[PDB]
């Protein structure tokens, strides 16, 4: 099994450790807002993903920096019901991509709680967050609902079928 090293950030309560979780665990577990990092495991499709979860509330995301180096594949969760933000995603997410430690990083966004009444759509996130405006980069908007799964395993799939 080959090892890929995935980062996982976005703005605080976007659903990241929940993500981290129910992909690892199977179930929907009880989550605080991250202060540190969190670190599983998760093996897919012969390969070994080494999922960071790092915390998103603003006063910590100068920390970020600190797990650029290495990272494979980023992960960015975004909390598609959180309309007044969504903006704000955009600007963290870019700061991500253009630090020059992550110009090689394959990446996937979760457009996550699509389970919510006020979904804003896959496509909306996409052009919302600035991605059509982005060549020569691997990137992809997968839906997903954390506390259910849907979408998850197929992220993860893109992260496998898009690392060369
Ligand atoms: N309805 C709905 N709720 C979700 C979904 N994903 C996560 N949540 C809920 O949102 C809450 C916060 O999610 P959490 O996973 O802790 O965010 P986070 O990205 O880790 O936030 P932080 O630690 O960076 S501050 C949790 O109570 C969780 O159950 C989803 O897809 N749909
Ligand atoms: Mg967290």
């Given at each position: 099994?080959?090892?890929?090293?995935?980062?996982?950030?976005?703005?605080?309560?976007?659903?990241?450790?929940?993500?981290?979780?129910?992909?690892?665990?199977?179930?929907?577990?009880?989550?605080?807002?991250?202060?540190?990092?969190?670190?599983?495991?998760?093996?897919?499709?012969?390969?070994?993903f080494?999922?960071?979860?790092?915390?998103?509330?603003?006063?910590?995301?100068?920390?970020?920096?600190?797990?650029?180096?290495?990272?494979?594949?980023?992960?960015?969760?975004?909390?598609?019901?959180?309309?007044?933000?969504?903006?704000?995603?955009?600007?963290?997410?870019?700061?991500?991509?253009?630090?020059?430690?992550?110009?090689?990083?394959?990446?996937?966004?979760?457009?996550?709680?699509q389970?919510?009444?006020?979904?804003?759509?896959?496509?909306?996130?996409?052009?919302?967050?600035?991605?059509?405006?982005?060549?020569?980069?691997?990137?992809?908007?997968?839906?997903?609902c954390?506390?259910?799964?849907?979408?998850?395993?197929?992220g993860?799939?893109?992260?496998?079928?898009?690392?060369?």
């Open positions: 099994n080959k090892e890929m090293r995935i980062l996982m950030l976005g703005l605080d309560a976007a659903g990241k450790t929940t993500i981290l979780y129910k992909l690892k665990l199977g179930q929907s577990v009880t989550t605080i807002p991250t202060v540190g990092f969190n670190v599983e495991t998760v093996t897919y499709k012969n390969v070994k080494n999922v960071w979860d790092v915390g998103g509330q603003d006063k910590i995301r100068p920390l970020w920096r600190h797990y650029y180096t290495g990272t494979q594949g980023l992960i960015f969760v975004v909390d598609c019901a959180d309309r007044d933000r969504i903006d704000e995603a955009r600007q963290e997410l870019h700061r991500i991509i253009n630090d020059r430690e992550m110009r090689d990083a394959i990446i996937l966004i979760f457009a996550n709680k389970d919510l009444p006020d979904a804003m759509k896959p496509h909306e996130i996409q052009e919302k967050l600035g991605l059509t405006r982005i060549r020569d980069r691997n990137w992809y908007v997968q839906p997903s954390a506390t259910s799964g849907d979408g998850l395993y197929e993860l799939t893109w992260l496998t079928s898009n690392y060369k």
